[model samples]
Target: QPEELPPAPRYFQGENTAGFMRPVRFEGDITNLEVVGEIPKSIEGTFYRVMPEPHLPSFIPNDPWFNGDGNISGFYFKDGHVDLKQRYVRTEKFVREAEARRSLLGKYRNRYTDLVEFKIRSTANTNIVYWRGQLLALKEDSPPYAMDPETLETFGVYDFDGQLPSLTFTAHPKFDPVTREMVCFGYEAKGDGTRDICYYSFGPDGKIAETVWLVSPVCGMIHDFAVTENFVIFPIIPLVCDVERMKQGGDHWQWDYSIPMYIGVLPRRGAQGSDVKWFEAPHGFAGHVANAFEDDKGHIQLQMAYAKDNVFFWWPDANGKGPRPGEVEAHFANFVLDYQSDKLPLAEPTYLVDDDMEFPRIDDRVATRKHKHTFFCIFDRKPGVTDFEFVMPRAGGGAPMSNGLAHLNHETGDIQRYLPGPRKLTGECIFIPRNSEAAEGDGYVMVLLANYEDMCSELAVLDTKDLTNEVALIKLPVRLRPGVHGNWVDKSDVDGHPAPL
Candidate 1:
């Protein structure tokens, strides 16, 4: 009555699989996690992260590393003790594959590769956020799935009480501290590879305040966006998408260096999709936004990591060519966008720092307003001091992994960094303010560091003002497999609890 499935290939066990890079398939609770240093009493919050962990071997041996199931991990800090718990987000895809006990979903984003019986394509493995008493697992391709912030139980797909009408939602939703609302966008909003993009703004009560629908000039990957005091910015790169390609079982996205990029700026408070202003930008790549703010002259200063070429080496070009090992990299840079201008300077942007880095973060307090400090993952491999390399290499070659955490001062171009010895790789860090009254940059940064030599992971907390001093390092028994993004919710803010003055 049923067709037999072939034995899973040995791709998971091959030499390409590094020991520390392998999936632990761990889902449970580990209490009283071993701590290497004292966790300050002031540090009281839960750090929530979602990692990509495959449940079964892929149908395609060379599948993308990010094409895995969403496993949510939480580190609850209270009373100077840490408790670790993880649970997989039960999406439709995860449920269907669980029933079959194999890879029912084939290619990463190729709808044609999916079995007709289980056509849902969302992995929900990109990012996690706690908003308005609900914990949501997000992917750019599908709707947000709600889960219990404490139990981690799936509440199925959320559509904002039947208000969100788009076919997709973004993982990188930004919160504007000034307006006390969240701003996010979804490209390919109509379906698989469509150019439809929807912009949304949600108030503190979790109600959708505004919605703007428009089609992008090019149907490509708008992985992240930025918001200034008066506008929301969308930086479109060359990761062109074609529904025809997916219909023919090709990759969902491919880089076309010739495709001209554009930036769409819409007013944050009062503007429709038709009022969006588009500005021509040089061809480049960017996936995350550190921060954006409007200057006195009305120009928007958008800060993010910009790559000269495609940094996603796993993604091939239009000519079907991948880069060599050290071909592409990203540098922290700033783009000055004048809403009145039709085109950018047509020159290279300004680099904020010399070190190669990505995944920039800032204190949520200063979002949409000018801020002072920027915390990011930096290439901190010092000669004769630390021997660091990417623990997991990209299939074709270039791995843009950072090894340390660094903070940049905007007032003065000084940088302070934290290097965790040899073979330790750092990931995106979240800045948690000391208190509601703390000044700008007065906070602690929580970052996860994977120790390749020891085959374990460590969650380190460093004072934002004093990066060189190690406040605490909570050792994890299993490697976290790396993460795209995460957030830290103070215990007072969790479950809609009122904060202490």
Candidate 2:
């Protein structure tokens, strides 16, 4: 097989391989990680995260930063102590390449570049969550791989006992705290680069309770979605995909700035194709959904990290151009959709917090309902805060590197932030409430902080009311690959988790 291949040059360029941004291919378990602060006895859970770390070079050296294999990191906290465990997801791509001792995959999302007949292309590097007594590693392009909750052992692809025949799944699934249901969908669900979508509602027993076959306005990238008490929202952004483009060995996605944005809404109960409603919006990009809910007036409010232009510069526009730093801007915005209007419902996104930020998080208890506070990672460059260690390579274009975490209070219009100085970088923050009966936003924020000065990674937990100081810091001996998204699972939920083999 190796002899059948041509020159397999191994080289990774840009932000994907910068400084500590480089891949650390080590996988093992470490006990009693050095803790710099005290861990609260009340706070006990496992924070599981996954980062895109390619084991070998890509067949196309300059592939998208997202086209790597998934390396999962788990931070276990209990009884004032913490431990670290890391492993690869062992997807079909990762397994085949490791066996061949070379990259059998070509470019990102381009099947033509693949060296063999391996069809499952998921890296499972986007997000990880605990559902129905199992941990699911998710990549938007492929079905989830269910793993052992405690040991992180991959049990292979999960399809709800063949109820879900779709080839793809969403990395971001909205869970209803009250109904104990997970609302997820798969765009291009029928096949590669198709407009068909399959929306499924999974019960707490890991059974598919309902399925909705919907269609998108166009074949585009639906990175994330939102769900309210009565509705599921899907935003078809301008990141258009074409099967012909993949045949040409081009990137899977390209922004068409002239295309109009569409936000579709379907009722969760007994919804059909005709029940799906689409509202036109201005052309822009919204990578992640913060949260969504219906206000008192019954208007659906969708909050997102809205950008005025493309932030993934490496994936250029149809004309082979991308926006510079100044040409684009990002902030948290509220896209209000009023379905009761007599005329065509025009969804207009209005700015809420004017900050360069992404990866917004709220307490899981108030996910689908209106709440007071939202936490997100921001690019903080205040006065005298200079010499930032990582500039996110050039793949992010002129996008601001997430250097700090901020908390925004909607009721008071007040903001508080925790900047870990210039030599450190930050990732997405997750809110762990104080107790089961704790008030909304009254909790601790746990985030990964990559410390360049110490050349290691530290898991920082801060009080939501006060982000100025760290309540605890669990330090790791090695720097972790800046991951995409993760979730917190309470100890009670995983109390009887089996021991690792």
Candidate 3:
């Protein structure tokens, strides 16, 4: 339910928005979902995914797609049977908007341009993960929200102990399976338009072990980061925050081409912001770091989808136009940086896979280690480029629509690309290691694919070794909520807990 909204923006009017980006309104149990093909009878656990679903007709005109309410959804599997459960994360913003029946908050992340002061929504909509015994829904603008995995009831915002030293928490946090530790950072941590950022490290004992206070080269938006055994890597592109623009009620941040691409590296032991060294690269925009590790020659190998251009619209150039478009293709690239060098090391990037890739994932078990396989989604560019539309809002800029998944094998110089065939649109690929004892890369690349013609959806499980085939296809009667990313929890991890109905 929502208050009377003024008018829907162009974002809600696009073909893509009405298509897969259309937010589902219902929330209830969808048990014993149908599987189109034969699946392993005993492959067990739950696939938890979080998506942004706005209440119909938001108050803000020209609303951005990223700022919707997070709907935490799941599919519990046992002996080849699957059940679906979903709930809305009840953040303060959600409650307020629901009561008023209209959106009170304004622009995406720029709070200064908002209608309210200090009382904005924290719609924990980006990422969801199970840590220790707690289920947390996260957004970078606010502290992570705690929820009951079974009841789907909100427990309010979390700050580990109490009030966090940093104002905001990152949606993308790295969990190290090897040491049982958690690593996350906050950009513009001091306040809006402030250059300050903070990093917090949590060890197995569930307490902050180290804190690194530093300054981002600019203010705002460092969405995801990479964590290695010895270092924490931050890719700070030109997406900048301007107090002047915000003061005058403009877009909070814009693309500043003058700024060079910076990758900030912090040593795990003792890294101060000033002590945090930055490396410059020819590239400017980066999102979703797949993995980072220390290589043999005391160098850092960072894998990410690198782009010379920002990934979205709304980000304008100095001339009040779209920033320079990326290379012929934004690529899944590998950069080896000699972070230990005194002189600034240049990122001689080698494009690993073809076309543009998004939402990178890997076997979490080998996150910080030297690993070979990385999986992600690939898309085809718009059929024709026109000045009227610089991007396809939900369709994701000139970036290709989700055609299929790609597996990059660095050691073998091979990329096994898989498309479930025509009319199939797969999204955000994730890897689930087969049992605990399976070797690295020995697992299934799990993804949800939807047939556009019929508006039907299914979970396609593909073996990593050969992307050419699918082990099974778990079909859903209705479409699943599609968004940025998701993770899997072992049946052993949640065995005793109630599977939400």
Q: Candidate 1: what lDDT? A: 0.79
Clashes of each: 0, 1, 5
Encode model 2's per-residue lDDT on 1-501: one tens digit a residue. 755675555665655566666677888899999887788878788889988887876666555557778888888888889988898998999888888888887777777878887768888989998887788899988999898877888999888789885789899988877777888999989877899988898887778887888899799888999998788888887888889988987878898888767788888779887788877777778668989999998999999888768877667887899976434657898988876554544645788877788899987777788867889988755654545334333123212467788899899999998988777778888888777667778878889987767768899989877897898888888878777898888775432221111
Candidate 3: Cα lDDT at 324:
46
Per-model TM-score versus the true fold: 0.93, 0.93, 0.89
> What's the CA RMSD for each of the models?
2.7, 3.7, 4.8
In model 1, the Cα lDDT at residue 265 comes to 85
**Tens-digit lDDT track for model 3 on 406-427?**
8877789788888776566676
Off by over 4 Å in 1: 1-11, 14-17, 344-346, 381-399, 494-501
Model 2 pairs whose backbones collide: 15-393
Say which prediction, candidate 1 or candidate 3, comes out ahead on TM-score.
1
